[PDB]
């Protein structure tokens, strides 16, 4: 009925606002990125700092894991992405081609492609093996806030400040669907649901919306949190109860019942905007991260 997430750890070390946290697919690690130009790796279960990965020339807005938990990709204001070997900490490839800040990134499930979005208003698809850009998509008319592959990597969803969410065919780079809203608020985040049938989109009017993109039908809206300014991550929690999880500009983590849309828990502890949250792949664990008055990551655990 309701989860009971409780604070287990506070992870300090970043020296500027944290931007993104992601659990490894194997559940062992959390990676974080920051405006401080660093990636840090932490133990998912004991919160123990593992290592710092450095090399970007400017701040990092996003980080993502490969399926074998062996590679990370990061998206930086330095206009590049970097692919890293997590075990050695070494930069394997630098992905060059965007003409402005790279804001978001993700591997496909196969882990042979990376998708990125940029302030340059494009979405790029990259070959992991060669580090070469395969496709540049003239995707949006304003900064691209999020990019995400579906369950089998055949589709990409992108969101933008231009007010659109778009679905793309990975192989051809073609736009298959545009989702619109008459009042046209900036879209600050999007991702596919775990089954790939829906997308969850955040807009800067304090609203999260679950869409059946095929039908162009909005099925659920989640409200009551604060999101008017930042590109805050949201998540489907599937390990126990079925929840939607998001950060908020009132310094809380919000958790909603997926079906009823009721807020079922608010997690208190951060002292600045909660810009990023992540849900552990097998356990009822949430990671949350906050902006520069706080600069910490918190790990929370629930029984359901």
């Amino acid at each position: 009925v309701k989860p009971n997430y409780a604070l287990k750890f506070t992870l300090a070390g970043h020296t500027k606002a944290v931007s993104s946290v992601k659990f490894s697919p194997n559940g062992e690690w959390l990676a974080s990125s920051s405006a401080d130009k660093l990636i840090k790796i932490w133990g998912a279960y004991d919160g123990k700092f593992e290592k710092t990965i450095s090399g970007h020339k400017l701040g990092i807005s996003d980080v993502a894991w490969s399926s074998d938990s062996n590679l990370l990709v990061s998206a930086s204001d330095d206009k590049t992405l970097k692919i890293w070997d997590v075990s050695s900490g070494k930069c394997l490839k630098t992905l060059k081609g965007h003409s402005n800040y790279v804001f978001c990134c993700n591997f496909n499930p196969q882990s042979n492609l990376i998708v990125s979005g940029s302030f340059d208003e494009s979405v790029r698809i990259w070959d992991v093996k060669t580090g070469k850009c395969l496709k540049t998509l003239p995707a949006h008319s304003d900064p691209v806030s999020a990019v995400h592959f579906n369950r089998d990597g055949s589709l990409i969803v992108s969101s933008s400040y231009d007010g659109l969410c778009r679905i793309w065919d990975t192989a051809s780079g073609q736009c298959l669907k545009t989702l619109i809203d008459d009042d046209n608020p900036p879209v600050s985040f999007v991702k596919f649901s775990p089954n790939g049938k829906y997308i969850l989109a955040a807009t800067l009017d304090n609203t999260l919306k679950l869409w059946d993109y095929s039908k162009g039908k909005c099925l659920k809206t989640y409200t009551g949190h604060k999101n008017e300014k930042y590109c805050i991550f949201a998540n489907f929690s599937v390990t126990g109860g079925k929840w939607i999880v998001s950060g908020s500009e009132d310094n809380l983590v919000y958790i909603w019942n997926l079906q009823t849309k009721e807020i079922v828990q608010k997690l208190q502890g951060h002292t600045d905007v909660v810009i990023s949250t992540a849900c552990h792949p097998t356990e009822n664990i949430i990671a949350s991260a906050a902006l520069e008055n706080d600069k910490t990551i918190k790990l929370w655990k629930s029984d359901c």
């Binding site: 500027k16 606002a17 944290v18 931007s19 993104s20 920051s34 405006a35 701040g59 807005s61 996003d62 204001d77 800040y101 804001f103 302030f119 900064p143 400040y161 900036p186 600050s188 800067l204 300014k229 930042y230 590109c231 810009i275 902006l291 520069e292």
Partner: peptide, 8 residues
């Protein structure tokens, strides 16, 4: 970029 306000 993400940690700063950049949207309309």
């Amino acid at each position: 970029a993400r940690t700063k306000q950049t949207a309309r």
